[PDB]
Structure formats: C-alpha cells, structure tokens
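Margin note from the TA: students keep mixing up input and output lines. Inputs are the sequences; the output is the structure of the whole complex. Example:
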Amino acid sequence: QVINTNSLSLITQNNINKNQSALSSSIERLSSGLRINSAKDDAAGQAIANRFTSNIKGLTQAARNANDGISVAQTTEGALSEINNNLQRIRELTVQASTGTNSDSDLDSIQDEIKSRLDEIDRVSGQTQFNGVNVLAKDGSMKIQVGANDGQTITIDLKKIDSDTLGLNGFNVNGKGETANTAATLKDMSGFTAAAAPGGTVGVTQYTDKSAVASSVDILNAVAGADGNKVTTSADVGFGTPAAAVTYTYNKDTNSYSAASDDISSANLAAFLNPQARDTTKATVTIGGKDQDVNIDKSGNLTAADDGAVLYMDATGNLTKNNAGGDTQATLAKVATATGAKAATIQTDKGTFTSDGTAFDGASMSIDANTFANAVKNDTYTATVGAKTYSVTTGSAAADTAYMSNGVLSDTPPTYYAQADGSITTTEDAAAGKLVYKGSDGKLTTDTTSKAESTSDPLAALDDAISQIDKFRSSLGAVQNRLDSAVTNLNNTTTNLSEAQSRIQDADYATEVSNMSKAQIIQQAGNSVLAKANQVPQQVLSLLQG
Amino acid sequence: QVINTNSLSLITQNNINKNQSALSSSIERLSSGLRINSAKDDAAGQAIANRFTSNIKGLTQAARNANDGISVAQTTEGALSEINNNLQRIRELTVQASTGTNSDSDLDSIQDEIKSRLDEIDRVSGQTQFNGVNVLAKDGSMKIQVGANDGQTITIDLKKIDSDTLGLNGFNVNGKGETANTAATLKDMSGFTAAAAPGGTVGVTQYTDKSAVASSVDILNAVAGADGNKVTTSADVGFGTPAAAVTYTYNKDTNSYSAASDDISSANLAAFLNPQARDTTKATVTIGGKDQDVNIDKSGNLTAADDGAVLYMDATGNLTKNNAGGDTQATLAKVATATGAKAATIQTDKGTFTSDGTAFDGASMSIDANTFANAVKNDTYTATVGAKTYSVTTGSAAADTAYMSNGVLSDTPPTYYAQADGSITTTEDAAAGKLVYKGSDGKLTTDTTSKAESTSDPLAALDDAISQIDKFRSSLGAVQNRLDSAVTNLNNTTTNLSEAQSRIQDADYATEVSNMSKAQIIQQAGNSVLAKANQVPQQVLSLLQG
C-alpha cells in the first residue's frame, strides 16, 4: 500500500545478487577443472599446489639427468671393455714370446705387433668422447643432479687410462735378453800387487785396485746421502770465518746441515744474512715480552717490518724500539751491544741469535748444503759417517784412508785375490769367495748375469694392468646400478607427489555439476519471484478506480 | 451513513496488511530456497544448521588431511622397498663371498660393490623427502587430524633408517674395510692443563697428556732400532765394572754395541769371556808377527787349541809359549804381565786385546745388546739418538725431557690445543691443525677411519636388518589401512550429516509454491474488496440530491 519506496522486490534482487557469485564461481570451476583459480579461494592451497608443481618439475628434470649419466657411463664402460680385450691379447702374446725356441726375427715381429696394439690402446684412450667431454683423458669427477634441491648430486669418478697410467711405458719384449758373462780374465787385473796373503797360503797373490781415492765432493755426497751424520769443520763462510772456535759439529739432523757457534759473527751478520749485493731479510727481535718485527739489510738501518716504517734506536739504558725517537739513527752494529747489555734476542727464521756483550751468539743456524760444500771443498775437516771416522786436511783423503767402492765410500780398497788355477776370488779359501766375473760394464762385477733390457716381470705387470682396468669397470658398474635405483626412486616419488598435488587442486566435477544445478534453479526461481513481486504494486491503482 | 469517519474500509486495509507479511515471506522463501533465512524464523533451527555446517566442513577437510597422510605413507613405503631390494642384493653377495674358493682379488671386488650399495642405501635414506619433510631422517611421529574437534588425531611412527641404525656400520666381509671414527670429544681430554697459549690467542687452551714418561728400556729399544747411534755409559758388567774410565761411547756401527776402554780388565777376563760358571772360549795369542792358537778358561790354564795339548807359560826374559816348556804353569794373570811387558796381543774374535804393564787394553770389544740392556737398565747414562741428546741418571727420564709418543721417543710431550668452539686442533690457528678425532682405539689418532676385523656371523646381522625394515613396512601398512578405513568412515558420516542439515533448512518448495499462490489470490481478493468497500459511501451524496 506504499508507492515502491518500501517495495519488497529489493529483497529478491539482493537474493539474486547473492546467488550470482555462486553461479559464476561454479561455472568457472567447471571450466577450469581446478578448485583453486585465484587468491579468492584458499590461498594456502594455491601456495601448496605451486610448491608441489615446482617439486614435480624438478624431479622429472632430475630423472632425465640421471638417464643421461647412465648413458655416459655406458659409453665409458664399452670403451673400457675393448681396452681390456686388447690387453688380454697382449698378455697372450707375451706368454707366447717367453719361450727360448724363438729367433730374433720372431721376437721382433711379436714386438712390432705388441707395439701396434699398445698404440691402439693409447688411441682409443684419447679418442673416446661424450658430447665434447673426454671420459678417459683426465682424473676428474662428474656430478649428476638427481635431486630437486641444490647441492644433492651423484659423483662419477673417471680415471685417465693410457699406456703411461697402466704402466710399462713401452712394453719392450724384444730387447737383448739373458746373456752369459765372460770369465775372470786374470790378465786384466792391472791393479797394485801385494803378496801379503794374510792367511799365509803360498799359492795366492793379493791384488788391490789403487787410484780409487775419493774426492772431497765424494765425501760430502756420502755424508749428505745418509741422514743424521756428523761433520766437524773450521774456516767456514759467514759463520766461522774468524774461526775463533773450531768444533762446530754442524748437528746434521734431518736436512741441510745446522750449526752452533759462540760469539764470532758480531760484524759478519751482513755478510751472512745478505749473500748478494742488495739482499734484505726479515727477522724478529724482542727485548723480552716485547715482540717486534724488523727488517735487516747490510747491517744498516733496522727498517721496521711495516711498508716503509724506519725504526730508530733509542731509550738509553733500556734500548727498545721506537719509530719516533729523538736520537741517532739505528744500525745493527750498536744494537748488537745494546742486546748484549740488555740480554735480548734477535732470532730469525734461519738461525736463533742472542748476544752477551758486543757479539752475537748463534744457537740454531742452518746453512745451505750446496753453499757449505762450495765453501769447505778445500779446507780441513773430520767429517764422519755411520760408525766410521774420516779425516780430510786441505786435500781429499789426507790420511789416505778413504777408498771409492762400486757406489759407496769404504775405508778398505777393493781386494781381489788371484788363485793358483788362474781364477780370481774375493776371498783366499776357494770354498768361499764367489769367483769374480767380468763383462759388459767393466768394474769386474761379481755376478754371472747382465741385466736384460726386456721388461723384468712382464706377466705380473700385465696382470696388474688388468686388475686396474677391472677395478675401474667395477666402479662404473656399481655407479650404474646406483643411478638406476635413483631413477626408479625418483619416478615413484614424482608419481606420489603428482597424486598429492591432485588431491588439493582439481575440483571434483561430481559436486560441481550439482552446485551448478543449485545455482541455476535458484536464479530462475528468484527471477520469477521478482516478476511476481513487481506485479503487485498496481493494486493501489486498482483501488483508485481511475 | 457517515462521511468516512467510521469508515468500513479500515478492516480491509488491516487484513491486507496482515496478509502482506505472509506474501513477502513466501516470495523470499521461494527466492532463497532455505526454510530459515534469519532469526525471525525458528532461531534454534538456525543455530543447529550453523553447527551442522561447521561439522560438515570440518569432516571434509579432515578427509582431505587423511588422504594426504596416505600419500606420504605411500612415498615412505616405496623408499623402504628400494632399501629392502638393496639389502637383499647385499645378502646374496655375502652368500656368494662366504665360499672359500675365492682369492683376495675377488673378495676385493665383492667388498667394493657391497660398499657401493651400502652408500647407495645411505643416500636413498638421506635424500628421500615429502614436501620439505624427511621421513627417514629422524625417529619422529606425525599426527594426522581426521576429526572435527581438536585433539582427535592419528599418529604415524617414523624411524631413522640408515647404515648406522640397521647396524654393522660397514659390513666389511673382505676385511680392511673402513668404519667412521668419532668426534673430538673435548670432555675426554683429562691431561695436564696449560693456558700458556704461546701464540697469545685468548680463546685457545693447551692441554698436554702427561704421565707419558718413557722407561729406560724404552730408550734402549729407541736407540737400538736406529743404526749408528751413540751411547755413553759407566758401571757396566765385565768391562767398565771398576769404571776407571767413564766415556766409552760404545761405538755402535752396524749391530750389537761395541766399546773401547783402557786398561781395566786385567783380572776381569775370567768373568767376561766366561759368562757362565764353566764356559770355555777359543783365543788367538801372538807375540808379534807369529800367530799361536790357544784356549782360555776362567783365567786359568791357557790350554792349547789342540785336542788335549796343555800349554804352560815359560821363557823368563822372552815370555814365550811352549807346548813343551820347562818352567812353571800358565795362568792368564801371569801372561797378562808377560804381554804387558813384551808388547804382544791376545786378540780374540769377540774383542781385540793388548796390554802394557800388568793390564789389558781393549780396542774393539763387542757386548751383546740384550746383556747390555739388562746391565744398564738402572744406571746413569747419556744415550743419544739422531740429532738428539737424552740424559738418564739412575732412573728413567732423570731430566724429565723424555716423553713416549705414539711409537717414537720425542723430547716434547703430546700437545693438544682446544678451540673456542669446542673443537680440538693440533695447532692454534684453525687454518692448519687437521682437527683431531678419536675412535675404536683411543690414543686420539688424527684419522677418520679405524680398522675392524670382518664380522661374526654376517648372515645373522643381515637377517636382523631385514627383520627391522620388514617390521617397519608392516607398521606402515597397518597405519595405511587405518587411514583408508578412516576415509570411508568420514565419507559416510559427512554424507549422513549433510542429509541431516538439509532436512532442517531447505524449505519444501511443494508447500511454498502453494503458499505463494494462496497469498497472491487472497491479496487480489483483498484489494478488490477494498475497492468495493470504497464504492459504498456516496449513497449519502445520492441522498443529498445535489
């Protein structure tokens, strides 16, 4: 009974408006097929779906990468298998070649063919490549990404395999083999004669090969060869040049000989620490509880270890370091007596030094071996070796008690005894002695055999190469099995995660068709009731009778 | 008969007003489709509908959660199946390798592949994940919400599965396999404490393991192991028992220690040459340029080296040896002064001897090493080794400068530095040090591996590991079926509750359309009767006749 200013059709319109959102959402949900289409839905679901999608894509790419790794491992394994076949053939040839019934032509032919197959192995090692990467040319590792998160990879170990790595660097089966050596040749013994015969046997004559006097450098090599020997010398370069003390003993412990000397170097620091005309050395000086780092050059200015800081000596009565003192300029000469008075130390890397008075007392010097030999090659010394004492006085073998053996220094010359029957034996009694032989190198070596230039133990070396290649092949096989397992895992995981993500997205149409029917029926009923509502007002017109 | 002041239409308007509310309610109900739209209807019904709606939504979301739990269980089960297959292959390989017809190379290959697959098991254990959650990395539990009200959950048990948990920590069938060692374990360092920190770093504390003082016998094996060392000792058995001279130095050259001593053994030959109570030793005596062979027993009769010839000492004025002399009987005491006066030698195999006066001068003695060690185990000596000097005074490590390292004697004790972060390093600066480890043996070795003898009953251990993983698989299966049953129950319950809530809301349209029709018809009737009511009054105007 009101003029449309309180009409009830507004309620119907509002209800239709409330329905329209559900209608639109239902139709759109049918169209997409995914429950979550924008942030208006459960945004947490959207984020979880996005994370799941990223995981699934990364997992699939990782699976493809693992397959690629399997392929590269397969190529490498095939190459290794044929290399193994070649090595087995070479071993078979070597087994053939060991028989003594073969002429030098036969051995040469076998060597030619073996060299051919070794070059074949080298070639196939260099040749094999997989997409610009040489599998067998370098001892690297290859990382295979099979996981979604960074840092999770599988490593394939690759070794450089060739003739050098497998060994034998030229198998060389064709060298001149086992050869019998020639006899004693009594006439060749032109050494010093002596009928001493300490056993008194009338039928033996002792021959000594003199002129084997070792040189001084030989003495130095002998002492340097062994570790832990003793050498006493005077008149050394740098330290010991005044030679106030003679017994230094140089304390050879592990490496280039050390030393120990009393107050002798006071002015020799520049000569020692600066071998050349412009050398400068780092050193550490402390007064006691005050560790300061300094540079020493030609016994001149004690330049501070800073970039360009220059230290000045000051503090008369204390004699410490200060960059900004107000007295005379610092030099090594006076700081020597300063340290002697204050009982400090100036120890450096190549020698720990202290002073009492006006001269440095060396403690733990360490002179270079080559320089030491160059300095004392022509002076007197009593260098000793294990359980032996050797004397040298301004000339090699002053006492004439050092003799050069085959390769070692001995106090006794090579003694050769000549027997009555023309043989030469190392000892008087023929029951012992191992009658000496001659041949192919001189020096009258006491063996019946000359070294054969062929490979020493060919079969063992070839079996070692076979073992190496088979270990490599086993490594590749284990890696291949592990990658196959990784692929199976990653497939199962990506399937499960795909279903998981499907449970969050991907709205069930079974519910959505019924929801659409709801929305459409409500919309139709609402529009019709809106019509029925707006057909009401004209009753007031009917009342007016106009 | 009244002019609108007692109007008869008022009841008509009032009745139309009453029915208008019903008409509007019917139209609105038809538009919405729900029986209750606001509190004007049965409010208790509205509250009940709200509660049912909340319950239905909660149950649906719980069903989705249950599905997610099923998916994660499936992924875990797949990973466990892969691990189980790997373990089966390990068992098969172990059964193969138990046979005694195999060489060390075959065992090496088998152990290599077993180790490879064990590392594969560990990798698949570590890298398996479900949406940022590692199922097999911890012994945790995951709660799945399947109910509408808080606290109603289902728990899934997860166990940490890896090579450590299953046991055997390196299956190690071949031998010389590797097991991981433990960490620094700062708390175990019970050695002597020293905050000295020579580098001055505040955060470093130096710990030294004291009580590592080597015994004197340890020094003896230390000196004896190396060849050519120096040992200075007095108060020795036999030679040096009077200890007239102290600096012997024992001249170790190649083997059991030698010696060099002045005239001290004059009467000590009987004890020294005859360690037991009746021993006899052969000897060679020469009065110069002319050798004679003799036997010595307890300094008594100088029996000739013949079968039974007995030598007596003779020749006053020359002091010769005659097997047919004509003077008094021979004793070593008398021949001692004979040789001392006449400058002869009695050099033997185990010692070169001469005498001047009435006492023998030893030159090239050779004492047995074991007898030496037993003799000087509890006396003062200053034995030295390569470039080192050691002092002992009536007791092991008198100077307290001897410390027993891992296997060698060093002048410095074992130095361990503990870092601020709880790590223990061999050096103060963390850049170096090779952070120390422990494990399986103590002694704090700087190794990541400690050996382990193969196993006891390998197949039993593999079987127990299989049983563990199989039990885990069964547990996951029981839980997974649990969740399937829960999903079925939730679906049935939410369907029933949805049908329940629908029966309270959702007004029957069958009665509602009839209500609309009745309201509309009665409304038109009311409007028309209102018009007819308004058509009545003008009969009074008809009365007025104007």
